[PDB]
XYZ file of C-alpha atoms in Angstrom:
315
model
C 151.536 113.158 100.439
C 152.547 116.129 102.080
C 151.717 118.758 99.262
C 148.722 116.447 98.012
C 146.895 115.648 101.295
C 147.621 118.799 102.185
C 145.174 120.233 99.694
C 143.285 117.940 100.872
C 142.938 119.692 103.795
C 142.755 122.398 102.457
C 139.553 122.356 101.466
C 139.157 120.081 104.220
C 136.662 118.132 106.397
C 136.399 115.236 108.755
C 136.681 112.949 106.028
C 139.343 114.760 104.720
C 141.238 114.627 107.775
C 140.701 110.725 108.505
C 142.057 110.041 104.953
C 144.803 112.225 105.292
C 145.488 110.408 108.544
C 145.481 107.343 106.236
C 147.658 108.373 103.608
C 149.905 109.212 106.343
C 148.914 105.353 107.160
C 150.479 104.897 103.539
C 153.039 106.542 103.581
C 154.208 105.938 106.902
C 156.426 109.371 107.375
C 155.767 112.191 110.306
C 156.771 114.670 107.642
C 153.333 114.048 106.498
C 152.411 114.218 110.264
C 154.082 117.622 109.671
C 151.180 117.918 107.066
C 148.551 116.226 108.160
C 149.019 115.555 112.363
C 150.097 119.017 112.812
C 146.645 119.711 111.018
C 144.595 117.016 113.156
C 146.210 119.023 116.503
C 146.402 122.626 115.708
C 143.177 122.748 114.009
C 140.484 120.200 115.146
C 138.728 120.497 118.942
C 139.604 117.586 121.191
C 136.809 114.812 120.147
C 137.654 114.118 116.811
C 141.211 115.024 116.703
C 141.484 112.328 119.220
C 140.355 109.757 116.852
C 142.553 111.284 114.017
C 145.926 110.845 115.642
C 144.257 107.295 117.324
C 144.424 106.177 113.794
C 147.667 108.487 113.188
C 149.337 107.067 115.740
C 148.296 103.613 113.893
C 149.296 105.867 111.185
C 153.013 106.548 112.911
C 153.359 103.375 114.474
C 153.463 104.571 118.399
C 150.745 102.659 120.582
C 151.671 103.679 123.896
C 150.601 107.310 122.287
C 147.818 105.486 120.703
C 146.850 103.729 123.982
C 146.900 107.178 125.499
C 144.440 108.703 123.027
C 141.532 106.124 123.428
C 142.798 106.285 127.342
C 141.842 110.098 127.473
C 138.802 109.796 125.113
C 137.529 107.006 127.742
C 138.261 108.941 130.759
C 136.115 112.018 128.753
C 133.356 110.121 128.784
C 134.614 108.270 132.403
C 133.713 111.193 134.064
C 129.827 111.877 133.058
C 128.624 108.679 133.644
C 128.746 107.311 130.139
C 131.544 104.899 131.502
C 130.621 101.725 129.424
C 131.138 103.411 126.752
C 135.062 104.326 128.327
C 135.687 100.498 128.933
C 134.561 99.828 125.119
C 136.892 102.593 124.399
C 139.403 101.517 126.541
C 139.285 97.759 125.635
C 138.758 98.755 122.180
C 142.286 100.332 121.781
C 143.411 97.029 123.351
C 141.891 94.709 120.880
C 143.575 97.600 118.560
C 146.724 97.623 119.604
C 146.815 93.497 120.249
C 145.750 93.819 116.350
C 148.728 96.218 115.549
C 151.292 94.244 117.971
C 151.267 96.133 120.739
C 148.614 96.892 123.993
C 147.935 99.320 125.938
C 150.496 99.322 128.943
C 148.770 98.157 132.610
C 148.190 101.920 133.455
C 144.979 102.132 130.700
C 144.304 98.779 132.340
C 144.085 99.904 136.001
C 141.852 102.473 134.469
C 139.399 99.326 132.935
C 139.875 98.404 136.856
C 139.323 101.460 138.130
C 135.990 101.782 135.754
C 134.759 98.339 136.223
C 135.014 99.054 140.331
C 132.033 100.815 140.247
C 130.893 99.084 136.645
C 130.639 95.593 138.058
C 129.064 96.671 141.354
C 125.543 97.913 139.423
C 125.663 93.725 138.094
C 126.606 92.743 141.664
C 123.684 94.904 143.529
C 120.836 93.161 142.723
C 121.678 89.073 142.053
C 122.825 88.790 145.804
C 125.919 89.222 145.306
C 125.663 92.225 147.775
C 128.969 91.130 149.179
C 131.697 91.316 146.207
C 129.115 94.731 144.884
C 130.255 96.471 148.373
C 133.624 94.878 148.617
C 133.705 96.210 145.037
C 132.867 99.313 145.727
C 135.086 99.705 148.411
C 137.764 98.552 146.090
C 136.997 101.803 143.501
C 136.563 103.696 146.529
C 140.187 102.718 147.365
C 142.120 103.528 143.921
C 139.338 106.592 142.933
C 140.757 108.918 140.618
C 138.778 108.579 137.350
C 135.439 108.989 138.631
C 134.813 112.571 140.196
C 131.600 112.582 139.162
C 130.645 109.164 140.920
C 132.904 109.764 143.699
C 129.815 110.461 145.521
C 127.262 108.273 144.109
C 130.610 105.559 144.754
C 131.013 106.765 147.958
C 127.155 106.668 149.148
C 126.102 103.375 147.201
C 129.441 101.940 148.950
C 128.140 102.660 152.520
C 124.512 101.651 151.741
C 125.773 98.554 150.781
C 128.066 97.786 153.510
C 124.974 98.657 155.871
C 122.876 96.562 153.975
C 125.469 93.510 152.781
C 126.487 92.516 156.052
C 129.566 94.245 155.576
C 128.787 96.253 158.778
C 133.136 96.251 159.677
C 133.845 98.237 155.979
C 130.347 100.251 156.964
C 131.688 101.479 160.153
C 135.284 102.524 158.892
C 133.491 104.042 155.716
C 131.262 105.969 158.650
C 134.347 106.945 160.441
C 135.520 108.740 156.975
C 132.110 110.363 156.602
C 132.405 112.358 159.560
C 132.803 115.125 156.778
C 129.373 116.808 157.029
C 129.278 117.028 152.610
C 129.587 113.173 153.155
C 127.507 112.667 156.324
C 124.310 114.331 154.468
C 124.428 113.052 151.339
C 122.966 110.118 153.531
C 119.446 110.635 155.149
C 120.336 112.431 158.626
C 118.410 109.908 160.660
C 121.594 107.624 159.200
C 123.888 110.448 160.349
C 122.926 110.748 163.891
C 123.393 106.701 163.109
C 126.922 106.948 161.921
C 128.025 109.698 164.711
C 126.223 107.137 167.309
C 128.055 103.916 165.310
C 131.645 106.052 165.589
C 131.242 107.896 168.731
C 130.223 104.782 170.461
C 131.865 101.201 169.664
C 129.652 100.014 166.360
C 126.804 98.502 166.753
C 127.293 94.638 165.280
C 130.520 94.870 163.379
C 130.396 92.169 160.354
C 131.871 91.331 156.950
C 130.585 89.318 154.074
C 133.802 88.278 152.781
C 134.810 88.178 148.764
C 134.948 84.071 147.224
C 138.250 84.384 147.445
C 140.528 82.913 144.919
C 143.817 82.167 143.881
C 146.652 83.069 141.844
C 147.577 81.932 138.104
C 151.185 81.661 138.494
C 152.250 80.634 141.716
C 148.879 79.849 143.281
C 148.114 82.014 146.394
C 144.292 82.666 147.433
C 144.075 86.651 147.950
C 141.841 88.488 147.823
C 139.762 89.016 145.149
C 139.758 92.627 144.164
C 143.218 92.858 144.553
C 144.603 91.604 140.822
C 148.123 91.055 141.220
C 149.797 87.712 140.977
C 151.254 88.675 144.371
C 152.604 84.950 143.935
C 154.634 85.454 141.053
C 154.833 89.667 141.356
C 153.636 90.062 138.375
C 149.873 91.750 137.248
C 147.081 89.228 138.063
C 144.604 88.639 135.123
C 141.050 90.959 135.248
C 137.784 88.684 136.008
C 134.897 90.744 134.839
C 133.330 87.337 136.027
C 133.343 88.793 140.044
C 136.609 90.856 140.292
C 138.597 87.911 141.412
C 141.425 85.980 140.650
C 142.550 83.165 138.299
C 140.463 79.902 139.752
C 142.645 77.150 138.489
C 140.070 74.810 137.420
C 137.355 77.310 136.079
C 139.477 79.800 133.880
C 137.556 80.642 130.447
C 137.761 83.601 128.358
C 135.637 86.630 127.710
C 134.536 85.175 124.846
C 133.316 88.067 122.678
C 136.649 89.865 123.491
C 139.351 87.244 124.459
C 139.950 88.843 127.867
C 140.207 87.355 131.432
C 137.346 85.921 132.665
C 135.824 82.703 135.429
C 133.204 80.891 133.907
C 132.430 79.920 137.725
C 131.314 83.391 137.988
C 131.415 84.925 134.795
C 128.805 82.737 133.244
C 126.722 84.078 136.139
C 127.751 87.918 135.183
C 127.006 87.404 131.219
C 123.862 85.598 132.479
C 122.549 88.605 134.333
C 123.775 91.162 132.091
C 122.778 89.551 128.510
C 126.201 90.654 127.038
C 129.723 91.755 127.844
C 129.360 95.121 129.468
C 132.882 96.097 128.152
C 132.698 95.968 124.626
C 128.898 95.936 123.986
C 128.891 92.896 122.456
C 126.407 90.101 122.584
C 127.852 87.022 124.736
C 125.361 84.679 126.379
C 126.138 81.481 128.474
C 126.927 79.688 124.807
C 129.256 82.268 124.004
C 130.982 81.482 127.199
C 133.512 78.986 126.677
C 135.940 77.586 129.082
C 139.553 77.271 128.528
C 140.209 73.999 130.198
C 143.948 74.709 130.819
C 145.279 78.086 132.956
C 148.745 77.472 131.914
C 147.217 78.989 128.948
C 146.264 81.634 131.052
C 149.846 81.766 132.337
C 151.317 82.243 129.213
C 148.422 84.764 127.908
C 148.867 87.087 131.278
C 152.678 86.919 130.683
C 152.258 88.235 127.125
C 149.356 90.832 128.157
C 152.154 92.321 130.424
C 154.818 91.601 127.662
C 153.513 93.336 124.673
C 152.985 96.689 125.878
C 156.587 97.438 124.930
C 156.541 96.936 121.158
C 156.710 99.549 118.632
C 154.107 98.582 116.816
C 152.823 98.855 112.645
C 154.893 102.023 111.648
């Protein structure tokens, strides 16, 4: 170990350094991560290092470090617009981890959220669902801070919707916060003599197209959709990539592919128009979707999604 994968790197190579990273996987000692880790950090550029001390960490037996280093790969490739790819990384270190019995904690899973915000709205745009894609939007126009890059694209596709949803309330207060002239003219300036007349003036036809909204797991309340937090029970509400909304408590089902929250009520609908999952890349259809009949199962599963985050893990 240390000596001997140590001339392994030595002479040295990706290879080299993934198999170091899995005698260290062997061997399970950091003294080798004095020999090998310190290696992966102090002498590979941030790509491929990140995968060598993702399988380290598997290696060392941390997973909220672990979590971390598919978190910051994802949010790499968050920021350019090859997001899917971030939510396979994402939920990839969370099939991972739930394989090496731990998960990633709920802060890489607001980040899922905060990608699938503006993910799920691009599935919601088009099937006329127009409603839950610009509530959606204004939902990862609310908690922004992984997407810089589509903070404008989020921000512009969010009031375009709005206008064009019959979400006309969320379209006027999204107008009143585009009275910055960078965000007033990213919109055609016939719509910005529109928005200043809209603002200036009381709005012209105020409206919403409100979310299906539905209820919690635990305790039962009906909020609101986007919002995922079993506000009944305080705890973290489960994630529907089915619309963004909450637990129905007669149409709970997996995702299927990926054994993640879904609503067959409206998640046979999203795997219909998308083909597959768009969160690990995996092929799901409408057979693939299967219902769990019972959300107590559900109740259970969301209690140990938040309660095995905390573990350890294979050291």
């Amino acid at each position: 170990a240390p000596r001997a994968v140590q001339l392994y790197l030595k002479v040295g190579t990706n290879p080299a350094l993934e198999k170091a990273v899995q005698v260290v996987e062997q061997t399970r000692s950091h003294q080798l991560g004095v020999l090998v880790l310190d290696y992966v950090n102090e002498e590979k550029d941030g790509t491929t290092r990140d995968e060598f001390r993702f399988k380290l960490n598997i290696a060392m037996g941390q997973f909220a470090e672990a979590a971390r280093d598919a978190l910051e790969m994802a949010r790499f490739e968050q920021e350019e617009g090859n997001y899917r790819v971030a939510h396979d990384k994402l939920f990839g270190t969370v099939k991972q981890l739930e394989a090496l019995n731990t998960k990633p904690p709920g802060e890489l899973l607001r980040a899922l959220m905060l990608l699938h915000s503006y993910t799920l709205v691009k599935s919601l745009i088009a099937i006329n669902d127009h409603t839950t894609a610009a509530r959606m939007l204004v939902r990862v126009a609310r908690n922004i801070s992984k997407f810089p890059k589509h903070i404008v694209p989020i921000l512009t596709s969010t009031v375009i919707e709005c206008h064009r949803a019959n979400l006309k309330k969320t379209a006027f207060e999204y107008a009143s916060m585009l009275m910055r002239p960078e965000y007033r003219d990213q919109v055609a300036v016939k719509y910005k003599k529109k928005i200043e007349l809209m603002v200036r003036k009381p709005e012209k036809d105020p409206e919403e197209l409100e979310e299906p909204l539905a209820d919690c797991p635990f305790c039962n309340m009906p909020g609101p959709e986007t919002e995922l937090q079993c506000i009944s029970c305080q705890n973290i509400l489960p994630f529907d990539l089915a619309t963004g909304k909450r637990m129905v408590l007669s149409d709970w089902a997996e995702c299927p592919g990926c054994k993640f929250p879904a609503s067959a009520s409206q998640f046979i609908r999203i795997i219909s128009a998308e083909g597959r999952c768009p969160m690990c890349n995996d092929p799901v259809d409408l057979a693939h979707v299967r219902k769990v009949q019972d959300p107590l199962t559900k109740i259970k599963q969301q209690q140990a999604q938040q309660t095995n985050a905390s573990g350890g893990g294979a050291s």
